[PDB]
């Protein structure tokens, strides 16, 4: 694509520079270009890809929620009409967000997931697929909302099955997956009891496996366990 003439290694190097510069749109374009070289990604390269797009879409979601809230305020009873502008600009941001999600899902489909044989890579990518369908679901309202949700559910569920079979309970990828799937359940699928159950079981099974870890792995796993607890504290 736009990055077809740059070396894979240079794109990865420049993704790392862009991260240091907090240039996440650049970071994402470089990692898109690296993915499209057609080689599978290393653990570090997968994380560069995810961090880049997570930062880009995070900005769009934050903006969308601001605009959505204004728009709902402007449609409540007793509100001075202000015309189409809020709706139009909310749609503008929403469309750009959906474009980013579609781009990421395209990379996963063509062909990161099908070439990911190892559990740590396949679970990572399936979690990402669930995540970006979840971001689509956050803004969906039409005849495709239910299918978007089920696409997220299906991706998360395949990732859960593999992780439960192939990874220890403290594996940070497995833990981050369960965290995000539980949030899916809570506020996307409107299944709060499923969300709470998944988070508790995930936390408790990790806690019982911490004894097997080095100090560095312990730090990685407990960091995500704290997020599970943070949510449970709000949900219970």
């Amino acid at each position: 694509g736009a990055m077809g003439s740059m070396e894979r290694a240079s794109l990865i190097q420049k993704a790392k520079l862009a991260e240091q510069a907090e240039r996440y749109e650049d970071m994402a374009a470089f990692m898109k270009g690296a993915v499209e070289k057609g080689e599978e990604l290393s653990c570090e390269e997968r994380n560069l890809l995810s961090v880049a797009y997570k930062n880009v879409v995070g900005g769009q979601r934050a903006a969308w929620r601001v605009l959505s809230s204004i728009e709902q305020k402007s449609n409540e009873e007793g509100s001075e009409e202000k015309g189409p502008e809020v709706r139009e600009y909310r749609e503008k941001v929403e469309t750009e967000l959906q474009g980013v999600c579609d781009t990421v899902l395209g990379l996963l489909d063509s062909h990161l997931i099908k070439e990911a044989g190892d559990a740590e890579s396949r679970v990572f990518y399936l979690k990402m697929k669930g995540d970006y369908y979840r971001y689509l679901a956050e803004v969906a309202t039409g005849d495709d909302k239910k299918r978007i949700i089920d696409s997220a559910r299906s991706a998360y569920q395949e990732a859960m099955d593999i992780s439960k079979k192939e990874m220890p309970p403290t594996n940070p990828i497995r833990l981050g997956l369960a965290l995000n799937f539980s949030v899916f359940h809570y506020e996307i699928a409107n299944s709060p009891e499923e969300a709470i159950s998944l988070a508790k079981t995930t936390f408790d099974e990790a806690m019982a496996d911490l004894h097997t870890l080095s100090e560095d792995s312990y730090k990685d796993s407990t960091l995500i366990m704290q997020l599970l607890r943070d949510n449970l504290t709000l949900w219970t």
């Binding site: 961090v51 997570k54 995070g58 995540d131 981050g176 965290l179 995000n180 949030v183 809570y186």
Partner: peptide, 10 residues
């Protein structure tokens, strides 16, 4: 909206 904790940045 109250955003719950999910994996990774932002």
């Amino acid at each position: 909206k109250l955003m719950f904790k999910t994996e990774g940045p932002d």
